[PDB]
Amino acid sequence: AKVERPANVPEDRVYEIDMYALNGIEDGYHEAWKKVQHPGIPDLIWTPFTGGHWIATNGDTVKEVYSDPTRFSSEVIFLPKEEKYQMVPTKMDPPEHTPYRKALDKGLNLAKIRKVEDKVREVASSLIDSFAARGECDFAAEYAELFPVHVFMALADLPLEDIPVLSEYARQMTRPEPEEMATDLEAGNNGFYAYVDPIIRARVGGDGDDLITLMVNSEINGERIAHDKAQGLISLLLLGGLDTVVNFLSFFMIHLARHPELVAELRSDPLKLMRGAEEMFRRFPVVSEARMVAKDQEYKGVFLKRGDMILLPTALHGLDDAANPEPWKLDFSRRSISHSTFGGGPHRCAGMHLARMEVIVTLEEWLKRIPEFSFKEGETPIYHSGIVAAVENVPLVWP
Numbered sequence: 001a002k003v004e005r006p007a008n009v010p011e012d013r014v015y016e017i018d019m020y021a022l023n024g025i026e027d028g029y030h031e032a033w034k035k036v037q038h039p040g041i042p043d044l045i046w047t048p049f050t051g052g053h054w055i056a057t058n059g060d061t062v063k064e065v066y067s068d069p070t071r072f073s074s075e076v077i078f079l080p081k082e083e084k085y086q087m088v089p090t091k092m093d094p095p096e097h098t099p100y101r102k103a104l105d106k107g108l109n110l111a112k113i114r115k116v117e118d119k120v121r122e123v124a125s126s127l128i129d130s131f132a133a134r135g136e137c138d139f140a141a142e143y144a145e146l147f148p149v150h151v152f153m154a155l156a157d158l159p160l161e162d163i164p165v166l167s168e169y170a171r172q173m174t175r176p177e178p179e180e181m182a183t184d185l186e187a188g189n190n191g192f193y194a195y196v197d198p199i200i201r202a203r204v205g206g207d208g209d210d211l212i213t214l215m216v217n218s219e220i221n222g223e224r225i226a227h228d229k230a231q232g233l234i235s236l237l238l239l240g241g242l243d244t245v246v247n248f249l250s251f252f253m254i255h256l257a258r259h260p261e262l263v264a265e266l267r268s269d270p271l272k273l274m275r276g277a278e279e280m281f282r283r284f285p286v287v288s289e290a291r292m293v294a295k296d297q298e299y300k301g302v303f304l305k306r307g308d309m310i311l312l313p314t315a316l317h318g319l320d321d322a323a324n325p326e327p328w329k330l331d332f333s334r335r336s337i338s339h340s341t342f343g344g345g346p347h348r349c350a351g352m353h354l355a356r357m358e359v360i361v362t363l364e365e366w367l368k369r370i371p372e373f374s375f376k377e378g379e380t381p382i383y384h385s386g387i388v389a390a391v392e393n394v395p396l397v398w399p
């Protein structure tokens with residue numbers, strides 16, 4: 001399914017790139033995006049796949065497209081253009097976006113995340129305890145996939161024995177399953193809604209500092225937030241911290257499994273581990289959402305029309321050597337860490353302080369128990385591209 005070239009796309013900007021099926025994806029997600037970003041590639045290219053859209057191809061363009069809601073709107077953020085779930089406020093621009101973002105920040109700000117450290121550490125040390133003694137696990141299935149849900153429960157103050165039902169709804173909400181995932185999506189979305197509904201009402205007026213009470217008792221323009229807007233926000237809190245983290249955790253663990261020497265460095269320098277979370281985010285970005293050109297305008301040599309879509313592969317910032325010299329090296333002494341792994345502008349990831357915390361703590365709790373490890377011989381991870389980079393089959397071994 002290719003669309004005809006529109007009149008505002010010159011011939012020399014056309015590249016045949018399927019964001020869901022990248023040339024070479026089986027050698028890795030980052031490798032495959034980077035093979036797109038050949039030397040001399042124009043800042044903005046265009047593809048007939050996935051509805052036809054432009055793609056920002058370097059750090060400079062990704063940053064700029066991410067950070068000007070006047071020129072590039074969150075009205076449509078997914079490709080292909082199709083959208084029934086608002087997921088507010090991820091599709092609002094300022095000023096609409098702003099009070100919803102303020103509710104989100106009440107649960108996710110840096111000072112708040114500090115106090116949640118011990119619970120996150122308790123999750124990580126628990127998960128790892130399950131298999132430390134074995135000398136083997138599939139990191140993807142036995143840690144990565146389990147960790148974010150477990151963190152949500154602690155953060156939303158939810159009974160741990162509801163993990164099976166929430167995991168099911170998350171599976172349906174994040175990776176739905178022709179051409180009716182409509183039904184699959186709705187099972188996830190509606191089920192989660194029914195699940196949280198009474199906790200929302202019992203937590204109004206409440207004094208807990210969990211995410212649900214925090215969201216439900218928030219104000220939007222002088223009034224307390226609509227019941228359902230609060231449902232939307234809480235659901236967003238669940239999703240946002242799921243798919244990004246599941247996959248991001250596996251990507252760096254794969255890397256560390258294949259770099260025992262880098263493992264020794266971290267293991268020996270606690271503070272260097274702790275201070276190099278940024279470097280990890282630069283090196284393993286996972287998201288490529290989109291912005292909608294908000295109004296006709298000239299940009300990067302071309303004429304964009306209101307309604308055009310620009311894909312923002314965050315991998316093309318972190319791995320851009322115009323931004324970070326020697327971008328393939330995971331360098332914990334890297335002085336200047338330029339990336340858009342969390343996006344930019346007003347929608348810049350609300351979970352970034354949590355994310356940094358989860359990744360550091362995972363890594364500390366990992367090396368306390370498993371100082372040395374490698375990837376199981378004769379195995380290879382399986383990758384997918386799309387909105388969020390996917391990896392599985394991360395069997396790891398240790399003495």
Ligand code: HEM
Pocket residue numbers: 077089090101104236237238240241242244245248285286287289290314340341342343344346347348349350351352354355
């Ligand atoms: C590896 C970790 C993560 C990465 C790489 C990541 C990436 C991103 C990016 C790129 C965006 C911007 C989407 C856009 O508008 O284009 C975003 C938004 C968001 N993320 Fe994260 N994220 C991560 C972890 C988390 C976590 C742990 C949470 C916790 C709930 C979270 C919650 C959110 C929320 C609520 C938004 C919407 C913010 C807004 O639209 O104002 N994320 N994330």
